[PDB]
Each structure stands twice: as C-alpha cells, then as structure tokens.
Amino acid sequence: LNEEASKLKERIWIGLNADFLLEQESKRLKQEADIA
Amino acid sequence: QLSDNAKTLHSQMMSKGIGALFTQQELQKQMGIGSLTDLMSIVQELLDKNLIKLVKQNDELKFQGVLESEAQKKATMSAEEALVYSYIEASGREGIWSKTIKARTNLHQHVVLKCLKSLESQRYVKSVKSVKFPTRKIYMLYSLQPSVDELDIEFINSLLTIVWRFISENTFPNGFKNFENGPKKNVFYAPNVKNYSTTQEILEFITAAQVANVELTPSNIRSLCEVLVYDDKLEKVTHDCYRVTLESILQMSIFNYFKMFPASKHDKEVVYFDEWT
Incomplete structure (x- = not known):
C-alpha cells in the first residue's frame, strides 16, 4: 500500500x-x- | 450547611485536622456551632461523598479531610476495597497478614484474594515479605516500606573476616612469622604501656568500602566484635578494649585442631567422636 494508507490506516489500527x-x-x- | 460545613470542616482538617489526634469531641472543640444531628449527618455524607474520612483507633474515632485523590481512588474500588484498602493503610508500617485480616473483615481467602490482586494492579499496596519468616506476605502501602531492618544473608562474613585482619594488625605489627620470635618482639616496650582498641575507628576504617555496603551503628559494630569474642578471634578487655587472640598462627597431647590430619584408612583401631554414643 502507499504511504498515506500506512499512515492513516495504521492511524486507525493504532486508533x-x-x-x-x-x-x-x-x-x-x-x-x-x-x-x- | 452541607457544603459550608463541608468546606470549612474540610478546612480545619486540611490545615491541621488536630493532626492525627482528632477525635469527634475535637469537632466541637473547634466548631461546635452545628447541631449535633447536623454535624453527624454531614460527617456521614462527607464519608459517603468521601470528602472526609474516619479512623478506628483508641478512644472515640479519628477523622480527617480527604486528599480527594484517595477519594476517587477508593471510590473506583469495590465495596470491600474501601474497608480493605483503607483498613490496610491503617495498618501502615507493620502492614497486616492474610488469615488475620479475614477474621477482622469476616471474609474468605478467595474474596480477600481478589482485592489483593486489584490493589496489586493499583500498586498502592505492595507484596511485603518482611524480616520475620515468610509465612506472612503482609501488605502495606506500596509507597512506603519502613520496617525493622544489616541483612539476614551473607557478605557480612566478608566484612568480618577482613576487619579482623585490620584489628589483628592493630594488636601488634603484622604477621612477621618470617621467623619464630618474629611476631611482636615483646610488643614494643612493655605492652602494658599499649592499651588500645578501635571500637570507634571501625567506621572510620569502614570508609574503605570497596563493596556493596552502607554505614552501620557502633552498637552493631560492637556485635561484630561480640561474634569474634564468641569466635575466640579477639578478646574483651575493659569493655570496648579488645585484643585479638592472634589465631593468625592458627591461621598460619600437643593441642591444636589445625596442623592435624587423620589416618582414617584401614586399621580399625582409632578414635571418633561417636563410636560409643
């Protein structure tokens, strides 16, 4: 996945x-x- | 008023609270203006609203103003953990033990175990295995562990056997066993003139450190000395004066336990310390 998917997606998972x-x-x- | 006498009653508590000596008669001592039922009902709700507290000791009962962090703390807890924690924080320094607190609170191991685990997670009480035998695991406030006591285990022997050296050197000069009369050479001129011990200097000597260690009391120093007395390593003269027995030659019919070796093989004609019993 692209970098923003890692950030924001990860931002949710860590959410x-x-x-x-x-x-x-x-x-x-x-x-x-x-x-x- | 509930809030007025609450805040001004919490004021005399937060300022002093008659220290820890407060009894309920001390309430009227400072503020007696409230009616008997009012001051009692407000103490009731301010414990219910946990804005003040009660302690069960001696005559009457103690009271205090809440820190309000303890309020929220114990209020988050269960019903027992109010009486459990606050009852144990009253145990303070010596803590309290398991089956003895059950009989006080009228409960069982399991039901007292759960609060032990809860405050365990809270870490406002702590596992305490004290100087007495670990049949206890008594628990006091995690924040404070004052208790009666060096330490029961070793590396006191190390400091003993080393200070015995320095003290032996303090008797006459060092071993000088290079030849027979080499030791002490009549201890200078008439050792009668030399009347000496440390009994004081020891800690001045203990400045050497070079080990995990702390300071120590001259009383317990004197206990170290008492051992070597019992050990027959040193000698007790005029109270704090001490003279080593010079077992250093021991350290190195005719009587010594050192310089001795057994036969202890084959021939059955021998001597034991039992063989009779």
Whole structure:
C-alpha cells in the first residue's frame, strides 16, 4: 500500500490498539515500579 | 450547611485536622456551632461523598479531610476495597497478614484474594515479605516500606573476616612469622604501656568500602566484635578494649585442631567422636 494508507490506516489500527500497546507500555512502566 | 460545613470542616482538617489526634469531641472543640444531628449527618455524607474520612483507633474515632485523590481512588474500588484498602493503610508500617485480616473483615481467602490482586494492579499496596519468616506476605502501602531492618544473608562474613585482619594488625605489627620470635618482639616496650582498641575507628576504617555496603551503628559494630569474642578471634578487655587472640598462627597431647590430619584408612583401631554414643 502507499504511504498515506500506512499512515492513516495504521492511524486507525493504532486508533483501536493504542490501548493494547498502551497497557503494554503500562507494564513497561511497572518495570520502573520494580524499584519500590 | 452541607457544603459550608463541608468546606470549612474540610478546612480545619486540611490545615491541621488536630493532626492525627482528632477525635469527634475535637469537632466541637473547634466548631461546635452545628447541631449535633447536623454535624453527624454531614460527617456521614462527607464519608459517603468521601470528602472526609474516619479512623478506628483508641478512644472515640479519628477523622480527617480527604486528599480527594484517595477519594476517587477508593471510590473506583469495590465495596470491600474501601474497608480493605483503607483498613490496610491503617495498618501502615507493620502492614497486616492474610488469615488475620479475614477474621477482622469476616471474609474468605478467595474474596480477600481478589482485592489483593486489584490493589496489586493499583500498586498502592505492595507484596511485603518482611524480616520475620515468610509465612506472612503482609501488605502495606506500596509507597512506603519502613520496617525493622544489616541483612539476614551473607557478605557480612566478608566484612568480618577482613576487619579482623585490620584489628589483628592493630594488636601488634603484622604477621612477621618470617621467623619464630618474629611476631611482636615483646610488643614494643612493655605492652602494658599499649592499651588500645578501635571500637570507634571501625567506621572510620569502614570508609574503605570497596563493596556493596552502607554505614552501620557502633552498637552493631560492637556485635561484630561480640561474634569474634564468641569466635575466640579477639578478646574483651575493659569493655570496648579488645585484643585479638592472634589465631593468625592458627591461621598460619600437643593441642591444636589445625596442623592435624587423620589416618582414617584401614586399621580399625582409632578414635571418633561417636563410636560409643
């Protein structure tokens, strides 16, 4: 697909998935909470 | 008024709250103007609206103004997790244990497990395996872990065996075992003149570091010394004065446990420490 299809299409897929990758990064943030 | 006595009652709380010493009698101490039923009903709803709080301790009951972050926090929680979390944050420093909190809250493992997992995700309480035996897994507020205590495990032995060196050197000069009377040569002139120990200097010596370590109390230093006493590595004279037993020759009928090797083969005519029992 062309580049805008990757951007905007991906913009939608991440549109839903930014919660998936979100809580992913939230665990990655809990890796800081490993300290306490 | 609900909002007026709410905001000015939250004002005396957010300023002081009579510290942590507030009882309900302290309410009338500052603001007694509201009728008995009004000040009680507004405390009721401001706990329902979680604009103030209650604590169950000692005589009467404590109260405070809400941080409102804790309000939203515990309000997002379930019904138990109000009493569960806020009950556990009351446990504070020492935390609280599992089957002992069940009997307090009248619940079961499973139903108390779920809130443990919820605040586990919240990370406002924490898994706590304390200095006592890990039969507990007590949980206190994740933000704070003050507790009674170096550490139970090793690499204290390392610092002991090394400081024993420096202290032995502090007795007379170093090994000088290059020949027989080489050691101490009458400890200068009349070692009676030399009355010495560190008992103080140790931490000044501990400045060397060169290991994972922190500072330590002279009391526990004295415990390190007590071990070597028990160890018969050093000697206790005039309280904090200490004189190494010079086991260094030990370190290297006629009696020593070192310089000894067993036969321990074939012939059955021997000696044990059991063989009789």
